[PDB]
Amino acid sequence: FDDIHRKRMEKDLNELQALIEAHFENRKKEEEELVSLKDRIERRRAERAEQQRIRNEREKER
Amino acid sequence: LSDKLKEAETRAEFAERSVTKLEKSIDDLEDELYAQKLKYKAISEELDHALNDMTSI
Amino acid sequence: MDAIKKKMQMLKLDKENALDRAEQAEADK
């Protein structure tokens, strides 16, 4: 019986460390990859938006 | 050719307009979408991170 | 809360069993 309790602590603490790591790392990987990716998407969209604004001004002159 | 050009030019404009309209709605999509993309997973991810710790009692 | 679902079962069962033991330990007289 008390071995059940020990097994529970063994899995919970192995899980705790796996989880402190997975909780943090899954977010740091997904989250930093996401902002890095979307920081670039945001910049590329802003660049394209500026280019289209310029393109629209050029057509207006045409 | 004049009519085909007007139609093609009109379509060049409409298709390019659709391209810049979609590039914009896509950017405006994706950009707002990445916000969701970056915060829905980070909020839920940090919620789950926190859960490992929230449940450490 | 998977951690809770199982910890919940563990503690409810362990406290209920411990309580059942507390109650019997005295109740047996």
Added chain:
Amino acid sequence: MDAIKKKMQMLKLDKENALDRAEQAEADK
């Protein structure tokens, strides 16, 4: 979450207290 922290500790305590009560009462009985 308060519900999980507060009750996990209280249910843990019911177990620990009941366990000690079982041992104590059993020793008396």
